[PDB]
């Protein structure tokens, strides 16, 4: 039936919206951990700038 | 009636004939309308229980034999764009080449609105074609 498959198609799109977003979460959890080096090396350049 | 005329041209005249049918679904629809009054319990969706057998007898007559050849082109109506419906589905196994049209394709300005991902052909083999 089309009505039942309308929901199935709708859920089919939702099920992959998640995968693409999940891959984006992985993409943005690499760059967060790559830029975490600043956490260590900050808070000392701007001393006389204060 | 028309199929009988084509059969005569195929057998007696031994000619290669074309047979266009539009629409073959109405043959199923008409039998469903009378099925209720013949004392037959409706099947799923609401078609007659003899949907598969009645269509099969007609379709098998539409074939090319050793005497002649019939090239048949039949138009099938998919009610409410639901290709899971018993009538469209029952007709898929009685064909050598299926052309599935999609409304979404047409709405985008593409004509003919063919969905190549759903079509199929029996002669799509290297042995037959180049």
Swiss-Prot record, chain B:
It comes from the Eukaryota. It is found in: Mitochondrion; Mitochondrion inner membrane. Mitochondrial membrane ATP synthase (F(1)F(o) ATP synthase) produces ATP from ADP in the presence of a proton gradient across the membrane which is generated by electron transport complexes of the respiratory chain. F-type ATPases consist of two structural domains, F(1) - containing the extramembraneous catalytic core, and F(o) - containing the membrane proton channel, linked together by a central stalk and a peripheral stalk. During catalysis, ATP synthesis in the catalytic domain of F(1) is coupled via a rotary mechanism of the central stalk subunits to proton translocation. F-type ATPases have 2 components, F(1) - the catalytic core - and F(o) - the membrane proton channel. F(1) has five subunits: alpha(3), beta(3), gamma(1), delta(1), epsilon(1), plus the additional subunit P18 (Tb427.05.1710) that is not present in F(1)F(o) ATP synthase from metazoa. Subunit P18 (Tb927.5.1710) interacts with the alpha subunit with a 1:1 stoichiometry; the interaction is direct. Subunit gamma is part of the central stalk. F(o) has three main subunits: a, b and c. Belongs to the ATPase alpha/beta chains family. This is ATP synthase subunit beta, mitochondrial. It comes from Trypanosoma brucei brucei. The chain holds residues 261 to 390 of 519 of the full protein.
């Amino acid at each position: 039936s089309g009505k039942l498959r309308l929901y199935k198609e709708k859920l089919e799109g939702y099920n992959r919206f998640y995968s693409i977003v999940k891959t984006i979460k992985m993409v943005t959890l690499a760059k967060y951990r790559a830029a975490q080096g600043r956490i260590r090396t900050r808070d000392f350049s701007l001393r006389y700038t204060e | 009636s028309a199929l009988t005329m084509a059969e005569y041209f195929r057998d007696v005249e031994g000619q290669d004939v074309l047979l266009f049918i539009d629409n073959i679904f109405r043959f199923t629809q008409a039998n469903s309308e009378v099925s209720a009054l013949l004392g037959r319990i409706p099947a799923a969706v609401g078609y007659q229980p003899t949907l598969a057998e009645d269509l099969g007898q007609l379709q098998e007559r539409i074939t090319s034999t050793t005497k002649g050849s019939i090239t048949s082109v039949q138009a099938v109506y998919v009610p409410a764009d639901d290709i899971t419906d018993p009538a469209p589905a029952t007709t898929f196994s009685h064909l050598d080449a299926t052309t599935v049209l999609d409304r979404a394709v047409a709405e985008s300005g593409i004509y003919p609105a063919v969905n190549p991902l759903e079509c199929a052909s029996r002669i799509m083999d290297p042995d037959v074609i180049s």
